[PDB]
Design a protein around this ligand. Structure first.
Ligand code: CLA
Ligand code: CLA
Ligand code: CLA
Ligand code: CLA
Ligand code: CLA
Ligand code: CLA
Ligand code: CLA
Ligand code: CLA
Ligand code: LHG
Ligand code: WVN
Ligand code: SF4
Ligand code: SF4
Ligand code: SF4
Lengths: 138, 220, 80, 68, 74, 742, 42
C-alpha cells in the first residue's frame, strides 16, 4: 500500500523528470526511510536532499527507481525501499521487493519461470521446428 | 601492370570469399557464441560480455563483405576503363608505364580523366556533362553520409532524441501537435543497413557519373 | 517482450539477479546444484534486454540466456 | 609620442600624494592584516607599491593632458 | 561499352554476395544436421576451420606481396 | 606559515625491479597476461594515475615528475633543432640572401636513392626544405653565426638533463606533500609574476639589448660577419647609442618617469617593417615590456602568508545571483581537489590560445622574412590550428572524466554545476536546433549554388554577381580597424595589420601582406565554420552533461567514463559513454579544422599571396578564383582540390617525391582505419578462432591467448589511423603545393 | 649488471625494437654495399 501523503525529498526540479507518458501510460514510485537528512544524486540528474523519515519520489521508469534504490543501498545503507507502479486510473501495483524478500535471497512460495531442464547446447535446430509451433527448447 | 591488377583482383575475390564463407560456416555457432542458430540469421550482438560481441551474426558478415565487393568491382572496372581509355586514345603505353605503381593510377587515370567531368558546370558556363558533374558530387555526398551510420552508433542518437522529445513536449504552440509513434533512434542492424545503402548508392553513382562523363568528354 | 531462460547448468551464485537493473530475475529453491537454488525470470515484461545477467553468469556457456523479441515501451527503456 | 616631463618637484609632489593616499586607503580597505595599530611592513610595502603604480599612472596622464 | 561492362559487373558482384548470404540463411534456417549425417554439407561444417584458415592465409599472402610490389614500385 | 614547503624524503626507492614487472602500477594488471587484451590494457591505463590509487598526494607527485619528464623531452627536441640548424643547415647563406635561399636543416643519407630528397635549396646547399620557421626566429633573436646555434644546442641539452634530474629528484628523493600542491593562490602569484612576468621582462631585455641593434644592422645591409658580437652591444654604450641615441641618457628616464625619451627603441609604429615584411622589433619590445609590467602586477593579486591579497574562494562565493542559486560556490574545492577539472580548463584554454596564435601569426607576421616564406606561414598556421583543435577536444574529454569520477553531488548542491546538469535537456535541445539551423542555412547555400550553376541559372545563385550575402559586420570592423590609426589609436603610425585594409607590403617582389577582402564566399565559409564549431560543441557538451546518467541509462556513472555500451537492450545503447562522445567529437573537430585550413590555403593563395610586378599589380598564385569558385562544392572540388593537387601527384622523380609517397601512404592509412571503424569485434574474434585452430593444428598456439581488440580499442584504433591518414594527406598536399608554387 | 635491468631489457617491446633495428641495419648495409639487386646474379 502506497501512502500518497509521504513527503518528498527537497529537490529544486530539473528537465530530466517525467514526461506526459507518466500521466498517460504509467508512472513509478519509490519510497524509503532515512535516518537523517542527506544529499543523494537523482537518477534523472541533479542533487536532492532526502529528509529524515519517509521519502516518496516519482519517476518515469522502473530502472530509474531501481538505480536510485541501488544508490541508497550502497551509499547510505538503506534497504527498506519499496517500488510501486501507478496507473492513470489510480491503481497502484506493488513491484519491488515483490514478496517482501529481495530477489537475490530464496523465499518460500516462489515458483520457477522460464527454467529449462537441459543445458543450452541441447536446443533444437531451427529446421526441426520450422512450419511447426514447437519451441526451440524442446 | 595487367599482372599486378589481376593479382590484386585475386586478392579481392579471395578476401570477399573469406568473409562470406566465414559468415556462412559460423552462422550456426562459434566458440564465442555456440548457440547462434537460436538467435537467427540477423541480430545486433550478444552484448558486451565475453569480451564484446559486435557484428557477430552472419548478416554482419554480409554487411562486411559488401564493402569488399564494392572494392573488387571498383578495382575491376577501374582496370577495364583505364586500359580501354588508353587503348582508344592510341596511348596504350601510358597504361603500360603508369599502371605498375599506385601514383600512376591516381594521377593518369583518376586525376587526368576527371577534368571534363568537373567542368560540366563552372563559373564560366555549363554544358551537357553538368548532370554527371552534379551526380558525381551527389555520389561523393551520399557515400559520406553513409559513414555517419557506420561510425556513430546508437546510444548517442537515442539521448539526443530524448532531449528533442523533451523540447517538443515543453514548447508552446507545438505541444498541441503530438506524434502517434514515439521517436526512437534507428536500431543497430537498421543503422548498419542504412549506412550500407547510402555508402553503396554513393559508390555506384560516383563511378557511373565518372565513367560516363569521362568517356563522353574524351571521345564523344 | 524479451524472453529470458535459465538452463539447468545454473550453480545458484545469484550474480545474474544482483546484476539485473530491472528486477526481472529471482532465486527459487532447487535441488540440481550444490547451492540449492536456481535463477528464474517471472518478470520478463520489465526486461530491457541489457544482458547484464549474461555478463554476470560464471558458467561456461551461459545458464541465463536473453532472446530479444517484441519491443514494448518498457523493453525499449522509453521514459516518454 | 605623448609628452613626458623631466623630474621636478611637481613629479615628487604627485608621487608623494599618491603614496600617502594609497597608504590611507590600504589602512581602510585591507581586510586581513589607534588607526595605525597592526600596521606592518607587508601592508606598507603593498600600499607604497600601489602608490608608485597610481603615481606613475597619474604623472604620465597629467603629462599627456598638459597639466604636467 | 564502358557503361555496359561496369553495369553487368556490378550486378555480378551483387548476385555473388546474395548467393553466399542466402547460403548462410540456409545454414541458419533450413540445415538439419540429423538429415545430413556424414554428408558433403556436414563435412564442410566439420572442416570449416581449415577452410577459413586457408582462405585467411591465401588472402594475407596475396595482400602482403601484391601491396608490397605496388609500394616497392611507387 | 599557511603557505609553506612540506616534503617527504626518499618516498620511493630508485630500483630496476618494477622495470621488470610490467603492469606493477595496477592490481588488475600485476597478475600478468592471460590474453593479449592485457597487453593493450597495459599501455592504455598506465598514465591514468587516479585509477591506480586513491591517494591524491601520490597522484600529484607522479603528475609533477611526469611534467618534468615532458619538459626534458621538449628541451631535448629544442636542442636538436638548434644543433641540426648549426651543423646540417644553410642558415648562414640564408642570412646573406633571405629572399632567394630556401631554409633547409635536414640532410638525408644516400641509401636506396633517397638522396634525391636532398633538393637544391640554394646557398650552395642540398637538403630537405624545412618549414618550421626556425631560421626566422634565429634571425629575430640576433643569431648571426652557427657557433651561437651550437651554444644554444648545448644550453638545450643541459636544460634537458636538469629537467630529467629534477623529475627523478622530486619524485624519488624529495617528493612534495599534498599541502604543497594545494596552494592555488601562491602558484598563480608565482606563475603570473615570475614565469610570465619575469620571462617577458627578460625577453624584452634581450630584444632591446641584443635583437634590436643586430636586426637594425641587418636591415641596413651590413653583412652578418661584420656585425658586432652581442656582448659588444652590451658593454659599448656608444655603439648602442649610434643606433638608438636615447641609450646615451641611460636609465635615468626610466626611474624619473620621463619615458618618452625611450621613444626611439620603444615604439608604437604598427604595420610591418618594409625591408623584412615582419613586425617592427621596437613594437615587440614595448609589447613584451608592457606585458611584463601587467603580468607582474597581476601576480600580486592573490593572498599568501602575509595578510594582503584576494582569496579566490571568497571571490567565487561572492558572485551569485537570482538566476543561479548558490552561484560559484564549491568550485574552489573542485579545482583544488580534482586534477581532471584543471586539465579540462587548461587544455581548453591552451587550444583556444593555439588557434589565436595561428590567426594572429598569419595576419601580423612577427619574424623578419617570414611573411614571404609562404611554406612556413601555411605550415605554422595549419600546425597550430591542429594543436588547438586537439587540445580543445581534450579539455572536453577530461571534463567528462571529472564528471564521471571526481564529481560529488553532496558538495555540489544547487551551485552552477548542479543547475547546468538540471537543465542539460534544454541546453542540448537548443544547441541541437541551432546546429540544424546552421547546417541548413550554411551548407544548403552551397547545395543551392551547386544546383543553380548546374541548372544554368547563374542569376539565382548566392554570389557577388547574383543575390548577395554581404558580410557587412566584418567589412565594417575592417573599415574601423583601417580608420583606427590617428583616430581611435592616435599614437599608432600604421594599422595593426594590413589584412584589414591599407597598402600592399611586398618584400622581394612577393606580397608580405595585403588587404583581405570579404565577400559572399567569405560569408558562407565563416558561417560554415560557425556550424562546425557549434556541432563539435554539441557532441562534446552532450557527452559531458550526460556522462553520469540519462533517461536511457540512469546509472551511467557506475559504468565509468569509458565503457563500450550497456548491451543491445533499450533498443541499443551503443557508444553511450562520454568517451564515445569524445570519439565522435574528434571526427567533427577534424572536419572543422580541415575546412578552416582549406579556407586559409585557398584564400591566401587566391587573394593575398603572389608576385608584385611593374605598375604595382599583384599576380596572385591562383589568380583570384576564390570569389566565383568558393561558392560551390564543385568549385572547391575542381579549383582547390583538383587544381592544387597537381604538385603532389607530379612530384615523383623530384625532391618533393617524399610528399607524394606520404600522400599515398596517408590515403592508405585513412582507408585502413575504416576497417576498424565500420566493423565489430565478434567477427574478428571468430576469425581469430579459426586462425587459432590453424596454429593449434601445428602445436604453435601461444600461451597468451589472442583476442580481438576491445570495442573501445576498435573505436580508438580506427579514430587514430583515421586522424593520422587525413591529417597526413592534408600535410603532404599543403607542403608539396606551397613549396612548389610559393 | 643488475638482473632486474637485464630482465627489463628482455621484455618484448625492447627486444622487438632492438631486433627489428638490427634487421633493418642488415638490410641497409647490404643495400649500401650491394645496391640495386633486382635479381639473383646467375
Ligand atoms: C591624474 C589621473 C590620470 C589621468 C588624467 C590619466 C589620463 C590618461 N591615461 Mg591613465 N592612469 C591613471 C591616472 C590617470 N590617467 C592611474 C592612476 C592609472 C593606474 C596605474 C592609469 C593607467 C593607465 C594605463 C594603463 C593607460 C592610461 C592611459 C591614459 C590616457 C588615455 C587615453 C584614452 O583615451 O584612453 C583610451 C580609451 C579607450 C576607450 C581605449 C580602450 C582600451 C582597451 C583597448 C579596451 C579594454 C576594455 C575591454 C574591452 C574590457 C571591457 C569589457 C567589459 C564589459 C568587461 C589618458 C591621457 C593610456 C595611455 O597612456 O595611452 C597612451 C594607457 O594605456 N592610464
Ligand atoms: C617564480 C617561480 C616559479 C617559476 C618560474 C615556475 C615555473 C614553472 N612551473 Mg611552478 N611553482 C612555483 C613557482 C614557480 N614556477 C611555486 C611557488 C609552486 C608551488 C605553489 C609551483 C608549483 C608548480 C607545479 C605543481 C607545477 C609547476 C610547473 C611549472 C612549469 C610550467 C611549464 C612551463 O611553462 O615550463 C616552461 C618554462 C620554463 C621557464 C622552462 C625552464 C624551467 C626552469 C625550471 C626555469 C627556472 C628559472 C629559474 C628560477 C631562474 C633561472 C633563469 C636565469 C636567471 C638563469 C614552469 C617551469 C609545472 C611543471 O611543468 O612542473 C615541472 C607543474 O606541474 N609549478
Ligand atoms: C532473386 C534474388 C533474391 C531473392 C528472391 C531474395 C529474397 C530474399 N532475401 Mg535476399 N539478397 C539478394 C537477392 C535476393 N533476395 C542479393 C542479390 C543480396 C545481396 C545484396 C541479398 C541479400 C540478402 C540479405 C542480407 C537478406 C536477404 C533477405 C531476403 C528475404 C527477405 C527480403 C526482404 O525482407 O526485403 C524486403 C525489402 C523491401 C520490401 C524493400 C523493397 C527474401 C527471402 C533477408 C532475410 O530475411 O533473410 C533472412 C536478409 O537478411 N537477402
Ligand atoms: C586500404 C584499406 C584496407 C586494408 C589494407 C585492409 C587490409 C586487410 N583486411 Mg580489410 N577492410 C577494410 C579496409 C582495408 N582492409 C574496410 C574498409 C572494410 C570494411 C569494414 C574491411 C573489412 C575486412 C574484413 C571483413 C576482413 C578484412 C581482412 C583484411 C586482411 C586480409 C587482406 C589482405 O590484403 O591481407 C594482407 C594484409 C594487409 C595488406 C594489411 C597491411 C599490412 C601492412 C602493410 C604491413 C606493414 C605494417 C607496418 C610495418 C606497421 C608499422 C606501424 C608502426 C610504424 C607504428 C588485411 C589485414 C580479412 C582478414 O582478416 O583476412 C585474414 C577479413 O576477414 N577486412
Ligand atoms: C631583465 C632585463 C634586463 C637586463 C638584465 C638589462 C641589462 C642591462 N641594461 Mg637594460 N633595459 C631593459 C631590460 C634589461 N636590461 C628594458 C626592458 C629596458 C627598457 C626600459 C632597458 C633599458 C636600458 C637602458 C636605456 C640602458 C640599459 C642598460 C643596461 C645595462 C646596465 C648598465 C647600468 O647599470 O647602467 C646604468 C646607467 C645609468 C645612467 C644609471 C645592462 C646590460 C644601460 C646600458 O649600459 O646600456 C647598454 C642603459 O643605458 N637598459
Ligand atoms: C595536457 C595533455 C594531456 C594529458 C596530461 C592527458 C592525460 C590523460 N588523459 Mg587525455 N587527452 C588529451 C590530452 C591530455 N591527456 C587530449 C588532447 C585528448 C584529445 C585527443 C585527450 C583524450 C583523452 C581520452 C579520450 C582519454 C584520455 C585519458 C587520459 C589519462 C590516461 C592516458 C593514458 O594512460 O594514455 C597512455 C598513453 C598512450 C596510450 C599513448 C597514446 C598514443 C597515441 C594514441 C598515438 C600517437 C601517434 C603519434 C602522435 C603519431 C604516430 C605516427 C607514426 C606512427 C607514423 C590521463 C589522465 C584516458 C582516461 O582513461 O582518462 C581517465 C581516456 O580515456 N584523454
Ligand atoms: C557528408 C556527410 C554527412 C552529413 C550530411 C551529415 C549530416 C548531419 N550530421 Mg553527421 N556525421 C557524419 C557525416 C555526415 N553527417 C560522419 C561521417 C560522422 C562520424 C563521426 C557523423 C557524426 C555526427 C554526430 C556525432 C552528429 C552529427 C550531426 C549531424 C546533423 C547536423 C545538423 C545539420 O547540419 O542539419 C542540416 C542538415 C544537413 C546539412 C544535411 C544535408 C541536407 C542538405 C542541406 C540538403 C537538404 C535537401 C532536402 C532534405 C531534400 C529533400 C528531398 C526529398 C526527396 C527527401 C546532420 C543531420 C549532429 C546532429 O545530428 O545534431 C545536430 C551530431 O550530433 N553527425
Ligand atoms: C613483398 C614485396 C616486396 C618485394 C618482393 C621486394 C623485393 C625487393 N626490393 Mg623492395 N620494397 C617493398 C616491398 C618489396 N620489395 C616495399 C613495401 C618498399 C617500400 C618500403 C620497398 C622499397 C624498396 C627500395 C627502396 C629498394 C627495394 C629493393 C628491393 C630488392 C632487394 C635487394 C636486396 O636487398 O638485395 C639483397 C642483397 C644481399 C647481398 C643479400 C628486391 C628486388 C632494393 C633494390 O635493389 O631494388 C631493386 C631498393 O633499393 N625495395
Ligand atoms: C547569457 C545571457 C545572460 O545575460 O545571462 C546572465 C545571467 C546571470 O545570472 P545571475 O545574475 O544569477 O548570475 C550571477 C552569477 O551567475 C554570476 O556571478 O545568467 C542567467 O540568466 C542564466 C543563463 C541564461 C542563459 C540563457 C542562454
Ligand atoms: C555457402 C552456401 C551454403 C550452402 C548453399 C550454397 C549456396 C551451395 C553455398 C554457396 C556455395 C557458393 C555460392 C559457391 C559459389 C561458387 C563459384 C562461383 C563456382 C564457380 C565455379 C567455376 C567452375 C568450376 C567452371 C570452372 C571452369 C573450368 C571447369 C574450365 C576448364 C576449361 C574450360 C572447359 C574451357 C577452356 C578453359 C579451360 C580452363 C581449359
Ligand atoms: S557496442 Fe553495440 S553491438 Fe557492440 S556489444 Fe554493445 S550493444 Fe552490442
Ligand atoms: S537482460 Fe537486463 S533486464 Fe533483462 S533479465 Fe538480463 S539483466 Fe535483467
Ligand atoms: S548468474 Fe548464472 S549460474 Fe549464477 S544464478 Fe544466475 S543463471 Fe545461475
Amino acid at each position: 500500500t502506497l501512502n500518497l501523503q509521504i513527503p518528498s525529498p527537497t529537490f529544486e526540479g530539473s528537465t530530466g523528470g517525467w514526461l506526459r507518458a507518466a500521466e498517460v501510460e504509467e508512472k513509478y514510485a519509490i519510497t524509503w526511510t532515512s535516518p537523517k537528512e542527506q544529499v543523494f544524486e537523482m537518477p534523472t540528474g541533479g542533487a536532492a536532499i532526502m529528509r529524515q523519515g519517509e521519502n516518496l519520489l516519482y519517476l518515469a521508469r522502473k530502472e530509474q527507481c531501481l538505480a536510485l534504490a541501488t544508490q541508497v543501498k550502497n551509499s547510505f545503507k538503506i534497504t527498506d525501499y519499496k517500488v510501486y507502479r501507478i496507473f492513470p486510473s489510480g491503481e497502484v501495483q506493488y513491484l519491488h521487493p515483490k514478496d517482501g524478500v529481495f530477489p537475490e535471497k530464496v523465499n518460500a512460495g516462489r515458483v520457477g519461470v522460464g527454467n529449462v531442464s537441459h543445458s543450452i547446447g541441447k536446443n533444437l535446430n531451427p529446421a526441426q521446428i520450422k512450419f511447426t509451433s514447437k519451441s526451440f527448447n524442446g | 601492370g595487367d599482372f599486378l591488377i589481376h593479382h590484386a583482383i585475386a586478392l579481392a575475390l579471395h578476401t570477399t570469399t573469406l568473409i562470406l564463407v566465414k559468415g556462412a560456416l559460423d552462422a550456426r555457432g562459434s566458440k564465442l557464441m555456440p548457440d547462434k542458430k537460436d538467435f537467427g540469421y540477423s541480430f545486433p550482438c550478444d552484448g558486451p560480455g565475453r569480451g564484446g560481441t559486435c557484428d557477430i551474426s552472419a548478416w554482419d558478415a554480409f554487411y562486411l563483405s559488401m564493402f569488399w565487393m564494392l572494392n573488387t568491382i571498383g578495382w575491376v572496372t577501374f582496370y577495364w576503363h583505364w586500359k580501354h581509355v588508353t587503348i582508344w586514345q592510341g596511348n596504350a603505353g601510358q597504361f603500360n608505364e603508369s599502371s605498375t605503381y599506385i601514383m600512376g593510377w591516381l594521377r593518369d587515370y583518376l586525376w587526368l580523366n576527371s577534368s571534363p567531368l568537373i567542368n560540366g558546370y563552372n563559373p564560366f558556363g555549363m554544358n551537357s556533362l553538368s548532370v554527371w558533374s552534379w551526380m558525381f558530387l551527389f555520389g561523393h555526398l551520399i557515400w559520406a553520409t553513409g559513414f555517419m551510420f557506420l561510425i556513430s552508433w546508437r546510444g548517442y542518437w537515442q539521448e539526443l532524441i530524448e532531449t528533442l522529445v523533451w523540447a517538443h513536449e515543453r514548447t508552446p504552440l507545438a505541444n498541441l501537435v503530438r506524434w502517434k509513434d514515439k521517436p526512437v533512434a534507428l536500431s543497430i542492424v537498421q543503422a548498419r543497413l542504412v549506412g550500407l545503402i547510402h555508402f553503396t548508392a554513393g559508390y555506384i553513382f560516383t563511378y557511373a557519373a565518372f565513367v560516363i562523363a569521362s568517356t563522353t568528354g574524351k571521345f564523344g | 517482450s524479451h524472453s529470458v531462460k535459465v538452463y539447468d547448468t545454473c550453480i545458484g551464485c545469484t550474480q545474474c539477479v544482483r546484476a539485473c537493473p530491472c528486477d526481472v530475475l529471482e532465486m527459487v529453491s532447487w535441488d540440481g546444484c550444490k547451492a540449492g537454488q536456481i535463477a528464474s525470470a517471472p518478470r520478463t515484461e520489465d526486461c530491457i534486454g541489457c544482458k547484464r545477467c549474461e555478463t554476470a553468469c560464471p558458467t561456461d556457456f551461459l545458464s541465463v540466456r536473453v532472446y530479444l523479441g517484441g519491443e514494448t515501451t518498457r523493453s525499449m527503456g522509453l521514459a516518454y | 609620442v605623448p609628452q613626458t616631463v623631466a623630474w621636478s618637484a611637481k613629479t615628487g609632489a604627485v608621487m608623494v600624494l599618491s603614496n600617502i593616499l594609497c597608504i590611507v586607503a590600504g589602512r581602510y580597505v585591507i581586510q586581513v592584516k589607534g588607526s595605525f595599530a597592526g600596521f606592518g611592513l607587508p601592508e606598507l610595502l603593498a600600499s607604497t607599491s600601489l602608490g608608485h603604480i597610481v603615481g606613475s599612472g597619474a604623472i604620465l596622464g597629467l603629462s599627456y593632458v598638459g597639466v604636467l | 561499352q564502358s557503361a555496359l561492362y561496369t553495369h553487368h559487373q556490378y550486378i555480378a558482384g551483387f548476385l555473388m554476395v546474395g548467393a553466399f548470404a542466402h547460403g548462410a540463411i540456409f545454414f541458419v534456417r533450413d540445415y538439419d544436421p540429423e538429415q545430413n549425417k556424414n554428408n558433403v554439407l556436414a563435412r564442410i561444417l566439420d572442416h570449416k576451420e581449415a577452410i577459413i584458415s586457408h582462405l585467411s592465409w591465401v588472402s594475407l599472402f596475396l595482400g602482403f606481396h601484391t601491396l608490397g610490389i605496388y609500394v616497392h614500385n611507387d | 606559515k599557511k603557505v609553506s614547503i612540506t616534503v617527504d624524503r626518499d618516498p620511493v626507492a630508485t630500483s630496476f625491479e618494477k622495470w621488470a614487472q610490467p603492469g606493477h602500477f595496477s592490481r588488475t594488471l600485476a597478475k600478468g597476461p592471460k590474453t593479449t587484451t592485457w597487453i593493450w590494457n597495459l599501455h592504455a591505463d598506465v598514465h591514468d594515475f587516479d585509477s591506480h590509487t586513491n591517494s591524491l598526494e601520490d597522484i600529484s607527485r607522479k603528475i609533477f615528475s611526469a611534467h618534468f619528464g615532458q619538459l626534458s623531452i621538449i628541451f631535448l627536441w629544442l636542442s636538436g633543432m638548434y644543433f641540426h640548424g648549426a651543423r646540417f643547415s644553410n642558415y648562414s647563406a640564408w642570412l646573406s640572401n633571405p629572399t632567394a635561399v630556401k631554409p633547409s636543416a635536414q640532410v638525408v643519407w644516400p641509401i636506396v636513392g633517397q638522396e634525391i630528397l636532398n633538393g637544391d635549396v640554394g646557398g650552395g646547399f642540398q637538403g630537405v626544405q624545412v618549414t618550421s620557421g626556425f631560421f626566422q626566429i634565429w634571425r629575430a633573436s640576433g643569431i648571426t653565426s652557427e657557433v651561437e646555434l651550437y651554444w644554444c644546442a648545448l644550453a638545450g641539452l643541459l636544460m634537458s638533463g636538469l629537467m630529467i634530474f629534477a623529475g627523478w629528484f622530486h619524485y624519488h628523493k624529495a617528493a612534495p606533500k599534498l599541502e604543497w600542491f594545494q596552494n592555488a593562490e601562491s602558484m598563480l602569484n608565482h606563475h603570473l609574476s615570475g614565469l610570465l612576468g619575469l620571462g617577458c621582462l627578460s625577453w624584452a631585455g634581450h630584444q632591446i639589448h641584443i635583437s634590436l641593434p643586430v636586426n637594425k644592422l641587418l636591415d641596413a645591409g651590413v653583412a652578418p660577419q661584420e656585425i658586432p658580437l652581442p656582448h659588444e652591444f652590451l658593454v659599448n654604450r656608444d655603439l648602442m647609442a649610434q643606433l638608438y641615441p636615447s641609450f646615451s641618457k641611460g636609465l635615468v628616464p626610466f626611474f624619473t618617469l620621463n619615458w618618452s625619451e625611450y621613444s626611439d627603441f620603444l615604439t608604437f609604429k604598427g604595420g610591418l617593417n618594409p625591408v623584412t615584411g615582419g613586425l617592427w622589433l621596437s613594437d615587440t619590445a614595448h609589447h613584451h615590456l608592457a606585458l611584463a609590467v601587467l603580468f607582474i602586477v597581476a601576480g600580486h593579486m592573490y593572498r599568501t602568508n602575509w595578510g594582503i591579497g584576494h582569496s579566490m574562494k571568497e571571490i567565487l562565493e561572492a558572485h551569485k545571483g537570482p538566476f543561479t542559486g548558490e552561484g560559484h560556490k564549491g568550485l574552489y574545492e573542485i579545482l583544488t581537489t580534482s586534477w581532471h577539472a584543471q586539465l579540462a580548463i587548461n587544455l581548453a584554454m591552451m587550444g583556444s590560445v593555439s588557434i589565436i596564435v595561428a590567426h594572429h601569426m598569419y595576419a601580423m607576421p612577427p619574424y623578419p622574412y617570414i611573411a614571404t616564406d609562404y611554406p612556413t606561414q601555411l605550415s605554422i598556421f595549419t600546425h597550430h590550428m591542429w594543436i588547438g583543435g586537439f587540445c580543445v577536444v581534450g579539455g572536453a574529454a577530461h571534463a567528462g572524466i571529472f564528471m564521471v569520477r571526481d564529481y560529488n553531488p553532496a558538495q555540489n548542491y544547487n551551485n552552477l554545476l548542479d543547475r547546468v546538469i538540471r537543465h542539460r535537456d534544454a541546453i542540448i535541445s537548443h544547441l541541437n536546433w541551432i546546429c540544424i539551423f546552421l547546417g541548413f542555412h550554411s551548407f544548403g547555400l552551397y547545395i543551392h549554388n551547386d544546383t543553380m550553376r548546374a541548372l544554368g541559372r547563374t542569376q539565382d545563385m548566392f554570389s557577388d554577381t547574383a543575390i548577395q550575402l554581404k558580410p557587412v559586420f566584418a567589412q565594417w570592423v575592417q573599415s574601423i580597424h583601417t580608420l583606427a590609426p590617428g583616430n581611435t589609436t592616435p599614437n599608432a603610425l600604421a594599422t595593426a595589420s594590413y589584412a584589414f585594409g591599407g597598402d600592399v607590403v611586398a618584400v622581394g617582389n612577393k606580397v608580405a601582406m595585403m588587404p583581405i577582402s570579404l565577400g559572399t564566399a567569405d560569408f558562407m565559409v565563416h558561417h560554415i565554420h560557425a556550424f562546425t564549431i557549434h556541432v563539435t560543441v554539441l557532441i562534446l557538451l552532450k557527452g559531458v552533461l550526460f556522462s553520469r546518467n540519462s533517461r536511457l541509462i540512469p546509472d551511467k556513472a557506475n559504468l565509468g567514463f569509458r565503457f563500450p555500451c550497456d548491451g543491445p537492450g533499450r533498443g541499443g545503447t551503443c557508444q553511450s559513454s562520454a568517451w564515445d562522445s569524445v570519439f565522435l567529437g574528434l571526427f567533427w573537430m577534424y572536419n572543422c579544422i580541415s575546412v578552416v585550413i582549406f579556407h586559409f590555403s585557398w584564400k591566401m593563395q587566391s587573394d593575398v599571396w603572389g608576385t608584385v610586378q611593374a605598375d604595382g599589380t599583384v599576380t596572385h598564385i591562383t589568380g583570384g578564383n576564390f570569389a566565383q569558385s568558393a561558392i560551390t562544392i564543385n568549385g572547391w572540388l575542381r579549383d582547390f582540390l583538383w587544381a592544387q593537387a597537381s604538385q603532389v601527384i607530379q612530384s615523383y622523380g623530384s625532391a618533393l617525391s617524399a610528399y607524394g609517397l606520404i600522400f599515398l601512404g596517408a590515403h592508405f592509412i585513412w582507408a585502413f582505419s575504416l576497417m576498424f571503424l565500420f566493423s565489430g569485434r565478434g567477427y574478428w574474434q571468430e576469425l581469430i578462432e579459426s586462425i587459432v585452430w590453424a596454429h593449434n593444428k601445428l602445436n604453435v598456439a601461444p600461451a597468451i591467448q589472442p583476442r580481438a581488440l576491445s570495442i573501445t580499442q576498435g573505436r580508438a584504433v580506427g579514430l587514430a589511423h583515421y586522424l593520422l591518414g587525413g591529417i597526413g594527406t592534408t600535410w603532404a598536399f599543403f607542403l608539396a603545393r606551397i613549396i612548389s608554387v610559393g | 649488471m643488475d638482473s632486474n635491468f637485464l630482465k627489463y631489457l628482455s621484455t618484448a617491446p625492447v627486444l622487438f625494437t632492438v631486433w627489428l633495428s638490427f634487421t633493418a641495419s642488415f638490410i641497409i648495409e647490404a643495400n649500401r654495399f650491394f645496391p640495386d639487386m633486382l635479381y639473383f646474379p646467375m
